[PDB]
Design a protein around this ligand. Structure first.
Ligand SMILES: *[C@@H]1O[C@H](CO)[C@@H](O[C@@H]2O[C@H](CO)[C@@H](O[C@@H]3O[C@H](CO[C@H]4O[C@H](CO[C@H]5O[C@H](CO)[C@@H](O)[C@H](O)[C@@H]5O[C@H]5O[C@H](CO)[C@@H](O)[C@H](O)[C@@H]5O)[C@@H](O)[C@H](O[C@H]5O[C@H](CO)[C@@H](O)[C@H](O)[C@@H]5O)[C@@H]4O)[C@@H](O)[C@H](O[C@H]4O[C@H](CO)[C@@H](O)[C@H](O)[C@@H]4O[C@H]4O[C@H](CO)[C@@H](O)[C@H](O)[C@@H]4O[C@H]4O[C@H](CO)[C@@H](O)[C@H](O)[C@@H]4O)[C@@H]3O)[C@H](O)[C@H]2NC(C)=O)[C@H](O)[C@H]1NC(C)=O
Ligand SMILES: *[C@@H]1O[C@H](CO)[C@@H](O[C@@H]2O[C@H](CO)[C@@H](O[C@@H]3O[C@H](CO)[C@@H](O)[C@H](O)[C@@H]3O)[C@H](O)[C@H]2NC(C)=O)[C@H](O)[C@H]1NC(C)=O
Ligand SMILES: *[C@@H]1O[C@H](CO)[C@@H](O[C@@H]2O[C@H](CO)[C@@H](O[C@@H]3O[C@H](CO)[C@@H](O)[C@H](O)[C@@H]3O)[C@H](O)[C@H]2NC(C)=O)[C@H](O)[C@H]1NC(C)=O
Ligand SMILES: *[C@@H]1O[C@H](CO)[C@@H](O[C@@H]2O[C@H](CO)[C@@H](O)[C@H](O)[C@H]2NC(C)=O)[C@H](O)[C@H]1NC(C)=O
Ligand SMILES: *[C@@H]1O[C@H](CO)[C@@H](O[C@@H]2O[C@H](CO)[C@@H](O)[C@H](O)[C@H]2NC(C)=O)[C@H](O)[C@H]1NC(C)=O
Ligand SMILES: *[C@@H]1O[C@H](CO)[C@@H](O[C@@H]2O[C@H](CO)[C@@H](O)[C@H](O)[C@H]2NC(C)=O)[C@H](O)[C@H]1NC(C)=O
Ligand SMILES: *[C@@H]1O[C@H](CO)[C@@H](O[C@@H]2O[C@H](CO)[C@@H](O)[C@H](O)[C@H]2NC(C)=O)[C@H](O)[C@H]1NC(C)=O
Ligand SMILES: *[C@@H]1O[C@H](CO)[C@@H](O)[C@H](O)[C@H]1NC(C)=O
Ligand SMILES: *[C@@H]1O[C@H](CO)[C@@H](O)[C@H](O)[C@H]1NC(C)=O
Ligand SMILES: *[C@@H]1O[C@H](CO)[C@@H](O)[C@H](O)[C@H]1NC(C)=O
Ligand SMILES: *[C@@H]1O[C@H](CO)[C@@H](O)[C@H](O)[C@H]1NC(C)=O
Ligand SMILES: *[C@@H]1O[C@H](CO)[C@@H](O)[C@H](O)[C@H]1NC(C)=O
Ligand SMILES: *[C@@H]1O[C@H](CO)[C@@H](O)[C@H](O)[C@H]1NC(C)=O
Ligand SMILES: *[C@@H]1O[C@H](CO)[C@@H](O)[C@H](O)[C@H]1NC(C)=O
Ligand SMILES: *[C@@H]1O[C@H](CO)[C@@H](O)[C@H](O)[C@H]1NC(C)=O
Ligand SMILES: *[C@@H]1O[C@H](CO)[C@@H](O)[C@H](O)[C@H]1NC(C)=O
Lengths: 211, 226, 287, 53
């Protein structure tokens, strides 16, 4: 479906409005869902939350018709960055098959972090099979946006690069790969290769050489 | 006390029945409701269907004509069949325990109530890929290391996702960082994993990775050293 | 199929332009004519007149007085059969305050017997004579139509703004009435004790024999809308909890059963709740 | 102008609105008291009062 944006500062309180207003007496669910991750049920009844969810997660009870369902996340931290769904059941609307449109929470103000670049040279067994491939591993940076640059000696190379898009870690930081594939001959004929990771305003470079 | 775990093929040819199963741990299967949910890249969460404690079926009309949610009461096992698979059906399929809630707003006598469900415990998910392309085992080359040292392994050219990596068959867990994979123009993913380690630890303390790519059932492993 | 959302083509402020309006209608006020096309219930035999939405049917005491040179004689024997010689008679210029409470089966907001429960009729020996029970203990009934309704003015002609059933805000629920189980069963096992005096047999309560809706039901008024309650759970003679009667509501009613004059009650907006005293009955005996 | 809120009735084209004197009389057993102070405020005590049928 289509997603709605939302930005709250770290430590502040998020107010996630539901997508579909109810027509009768309701029973709304709230699922926290991160991409590539199993969703977790935050709140099942209009306000009841299961064991293992913190008190900072709050729902609105349905005591009088007219109230609008909102999810309240007090003290938002970096981990609360996910998709949130408003499963809206009520009396007059039918069967709630649809979880509804997502509200992607993006907590602002997280600390900045610097990449941990590491570049391995082609493997000997790899070189034996007439196939060489360098590997540049960027990790532990934030915000999740890096610019890789492969330099054969001094002149740059762009034919043969494949850069994985930034993805979040368990530290709530980002990590990305970048592979330079080249024939085993052009790996020895060159002086040295380099991988230049540019993150935010700073560049950092790890170089390797055939020896 | 109740866990879950999926089990799938990882790859299904177009227009063919896709079959998955789930195994409940710690509770009677014929005692709760069970649901299937799948998330594709782009489309939000989609509720496939659910099976009652009475094992009565009810599917999402978005795919009701193509879903069969079965069960095996004997061995705590629940299944799913999805016939006529197409490229859009590729997603991460989850199975979860649906709990029935009875929301009462008027008189229970006049039926002034409705039935709402909420899935409170899910499986870990099974990734399925829809492409007539064939399967392919990987190729794990060792990445030799060189304050602290860092070594890894280059899992090259496989299809399809996922791939399981572990160090020393489960002994080494700290300092590891498996990286997300790179889809190549040839059409096959390549992955990488590394582990930061003390500089002196490579005296002879064998560091051996463990690579599993089950969609081809080609489990391998390799050792790293200078 | 309890209530309907109906659309109709309607005349506008101008005589040639047509408008497409929608309005809610109770199922009872509508008949299915010979693809989900319907028709008002009383257009096939009567002229319909909407109540001016300002006048109210709230029953207030009426004092019936006799002209000068006339008199009113009042009986005060607290056992008076309703017929024959009464002593202790007194004269009054005017009757007491009498509320015109129009109900069926159950007598609402009436007077009470001071002692006993006085059965009244002409000839109790046949059956077609209506028995009228009087009571000393009043069972308190509580009725309500819980659907938060909206009034919607529609344009139908020059200065002719008929008021229709707009929209149901909130839940869809069911109108009904509550009576206490122990209390109604107590005071009904009381009327049973008095029928044995004249008929030395075993008395019985079944339900209304059938026919039109108004005769079979406990029809009355409440807040400004006319209820129709199924009284089967009240009369089934079986010698704590509470009982609840399923009621419906009509807007096209025809009180004072004229030749062909219908009546539209404009919808009362909001939550309707009225509590009333049941002070009597009106039974009919089988042959 | 008045079709959006009222019912229109045309005067029967024979009746006329010509203002003619109206004599308001009181029933028998009643009386009408007339003030004749040619400065009467319209309110309060007036003397020289006379009665008329
Ligand atoms: C004429 O006669 C008529 C007939 O007699 C009569 O009709 C009656 O009308 C009234 C009003 O319209 C009706 O009252 C409603 O009753 C509903 C049901 O209430 C009972 O059930 C609940 C829930 O029971 C489950 O949960 C509890 C514990 O949570 C368990 O103990 C139960 O066993 C049960 O759990 C099982 O249930 C299922 C079946 O097995 C399973 O699915 C489940 O897994 C479990 O196994 C009880 O909690 C209630 O307890 C209350 O009352 C009892 C008295 O017996 C006391 O203990 C105590 O006082 C409690 O307060 C009760 O027993 C109510 O749900 C309903 O109230 C809600 O709905 C309305 C409309 O939607 C809302 O406006 C209202 O505000 C309430 O909303 C709250 O609750 C919902 C649902 O939980 C929430 O979603 C919502 O957000 C809100 O929660 C908030 O408030 C809660 C408290 O209010 C609070 O706890 C929350 O934390 C949150 O802050 C309403 O009261 C009545 O049913 C009609 N009669 C009949 C027979 O139905 C009529 O009035 C008469 N008079 C006339 C016509 O004039
Ligand atoms: C009874 O039936 C009538 C139709 O005969 C319903 O009117 C329709 O109501 C819906 C919802 O109010 C309207 O659609 C909505 O449009 C607005 C504005 O674009 C938007 O906010 C909503 O997302 C939705 O699209 C629809 O236009 C309206 N039709 C007309 C002609 O006005 C009425 O809601 C029904 N009510 C009940 C109680 O059954
Ligand atoms: C039998 O008598 C009782 C008692 O008079 C009647 O209850 C009365 O019902 C009327 C109409 O619904 C109530 O009027 C309402 O008053 C409330 C508050 O004053 C107001 O919010 C409403 O707009 C409406 O005007 C009246 O209050 C209520 N009387 C009492 C004492 O509660 C009952 O309706 C009678 N039964 C029959 C069948 O006539
Ligand atoms: C019943 O419906 C009406 C509207 O259909 C609601 O009335 C509202 O009452 C509040 C009370 O302060 C007012 O502020 C609003 O302006 C009213 N609404 C309108 C449209 O006038 C009433 O809340 C409803 N009752 C429910 C849903 O229980
Ligand atoms: C005769 O009828 C009158 C009613 O018209 C009864 O008189 C009332 O009795 C009560 C009881 O003490 C008094 O409180 C009232 O003041 C009396 N009313 C009047 C107008 O006097 C009287 O009780 C009746 N007698 C019998 C034997 O039934
Ligand atoms: C419903 O019944 C009660 C009980 O009989 C009535 O309460 C009496 O009301 C009269 C009204 O004239 C008072 O004079 C009495 O003092 C009340 N006595 C008791 C014991 O309540 C109540 O008025 C009745 N309400 C209606 C609308 O009929
Ligand atoms: C008292 O009121 C009467 C009117 O009712 C006045 O009487 C009239 O006076 C004029 C003046 O001469 C006469 O031509 C009329 O014939 C009188 N009418 C009657 C019926 O007699 C009188 O003038 C008033 N007096 C004062 C002092 O104002
Ligand atoms: C009203 O008349 C028009 C034709 O002018 C038609 O299209 C429409 O369906 C009619 N609606 C109803 C409710 O009869
Ligand atoms: C009028 O309508 C009623 C609806 O109940 C129907 O039963 C009856 O046969 C009709 N009679 C006439 C004369 O139209
Ligand atoms: C009222 O009439 C009954 C009729 O049987 C009689 O028994 C009773 O004594 C009368 N009450 C009086 C006269 O006070
Ligand atoms: C009613 O009471 C009078 C009292 O005189 C009695 O004569 C008559 O038979 C009674 N009739 C009925 C039907 O109870
Ligand atoms: C009401 O009259 C009945 C008649 O049998 C009697 O049994 C009951 O005791 C009376 N109750 C009161 C309160 O007068
Ligand atoms: C009358 O009483 C009993 C209760 O069901 C039964 O014999 C009969 O069906 C009832 N209804 C009638 C006779 O119409
Ligand atoms: C009245 O209610 C009884 C049960 O309470 C039901 O069997 C009967 O059909 C109902 N009759 C009407 C006319 O609603
Ligand atoms: C009726 O027409 C008058 C013309 O002056 C206009 O001003 C007014 O808004 C209209 N009102 C209604 C209720 O139609
Ligand atoms: C009429 O009333 C005024 C009031 O001030 C008074 O001055 C005048 O004398 C009165 N005329 C009489 C009494 O003729």
């Amino acid at each position: 479906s289509y997603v709605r944006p939302l930005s709250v500062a770290l430590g502040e309180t998020a107010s996630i409005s539901c997508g579909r207003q109810a027509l009768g007496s309701r029973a709304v669910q709230w699922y926290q869902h991160r991409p590539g991750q199993a969703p977790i049920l935050l709140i099942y009844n209009n306000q009841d939350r299961p064991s293992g969810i913190p008190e900072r997660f709050s729902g609105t009870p349905d005591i009088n018709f007219g109230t609008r369902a909102t999810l309240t996340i007090s003290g938002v931290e970096a981990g609360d960055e996910a998709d949130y769904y408003c499963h809206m059941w009520d009396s007059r609307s039918g069967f709630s098959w649809s979880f509804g449109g997502a509200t992607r929470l993006t907590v602002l103000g997280q600390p900045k972090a610097a990449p941990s670049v590491t570049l391995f040279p082609p493997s000997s067994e790899e070189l034996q099979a007439n196939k060489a491939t360098l590997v540049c591993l960027i990790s532990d940076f934030y915000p999740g946006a890096v610019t890789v640059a492969w330099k054969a000696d001094s002149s740059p190379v762009k034919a043969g690069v494949e850069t994985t898009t930034p993805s979040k870690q368990s530290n709530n930081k980002y990590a990305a790969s970048s592979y330079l594939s080249l024939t085993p001959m052009q790996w020895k004929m060159h002086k040295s290769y380099s991988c230049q990771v540019t993150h935010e305003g700073s560049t950092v470079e790890k170089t390797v050489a055939p020896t | 006390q109740v866990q879950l775990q999926e089990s799938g093929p990882g790859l299904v040819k177009p227009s063919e029945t896709l079959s998955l199963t789930c195994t409940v741990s710690g509770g009677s299967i014929s005692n709760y409701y069970w649901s299937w949910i799948r998330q594709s890249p782009g489309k939000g969460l989609e509720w496939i269907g659910y099976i009652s404690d009475s094992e009565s079926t009810n599917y999402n009309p978005s795919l009701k004509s193509r879903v069969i949610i079965s069960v095996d009461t004997s061995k705590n096992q629940l299944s799913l069949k999805l016939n006529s698979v197409t490229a859009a059906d590729s997603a991460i399929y989850y199975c979860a325990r649906a709990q029935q809630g009875k929301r009462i707003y008027g008189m229970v006598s006049f039926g002034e109530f409705f039935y709402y469900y909420y899935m409170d415990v899910w499986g870990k998910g099974t990734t399925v890929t829809v492409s007539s392309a064939s399967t392919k085992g990987p190729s794990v080359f060792p990445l030799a290391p060189s304050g602290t040292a860092a070594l890894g392994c280059l899992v090259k050219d496989y299809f399809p996702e996922p791939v399981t990596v572990s160090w020393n068959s489960g002994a080494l867990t700290s300092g590891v960082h498996t990286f997300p994979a790179v889809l190549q123009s040839s059409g096959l993913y390549s992955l990488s994993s590394v582990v930061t380690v003390p500089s002196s630890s490579l005296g002879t303390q064998t560091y051996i990775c463990n690579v599993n790519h089950k969609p081809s059932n080609t489990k391998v492993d390799k050792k790293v050293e200078p | 199929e309890e209530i309907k959302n109906c659309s109709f083509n309607a005349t506008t402020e101008l005589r040639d332009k047509k408008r497409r309006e929608y309005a809610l209608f109770y199922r009872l006020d509508i008949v299915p004519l010979s693809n989900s096309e319907y028709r008002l219930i009383n257009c096939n035999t009567s002229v319909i007149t909407q109540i001016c939405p300002k006048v109210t049917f709230d029953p207030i005491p009426i004092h019936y007085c006799a002209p000068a040179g006339y008199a009113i004689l009042k009986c005060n024997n607290k056992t008076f059969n309703g017929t024959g010689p009464c002593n202790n008679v007194s004269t009054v210029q005017c009757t007491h305050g009498i509320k015109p409470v129009v109900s069926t089966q159950l007598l609402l907001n009436g007077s009470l017997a001071e002692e006993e429960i006085i059965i009244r009729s002409e000839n109790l020996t046949d059956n077609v004579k209506t028995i009228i029970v009087h009571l000393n203990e009043s069972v308190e009934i509580t009725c309500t139509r819980p659907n938060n309704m909206t009034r919607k003015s529609v344009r139908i002609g020059p200065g002719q703004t008929f008021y229709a059933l707009g929209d149901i805000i909130g839940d869809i629920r069911q109108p009904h009435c509550n009576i206490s189980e122990i209390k109604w069963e107590k005071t009904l096992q009381r009327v049973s004790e008095k029928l044995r005096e004249h008929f030395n047999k075993t008395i019985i309560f079944n339900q209304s024999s059938g026919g039109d809706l108004e005769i079979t039901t406990h029809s009355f008024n409440c807040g400004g809308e006319f209820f129709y309650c199924n009284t089967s759970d009240l009369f089934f003679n079986k010698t704590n909890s509470t009982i609840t009667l399923p009621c419906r509501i009509k807007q096209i009613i025809n009180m004072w059963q004229e030749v062909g004059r219908a009546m539209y009650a404009p919808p009362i907006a909001g939550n309707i709740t009225c509590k009333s005293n049941i002070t009597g009955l009106l039974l009919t005996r089988d042959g």
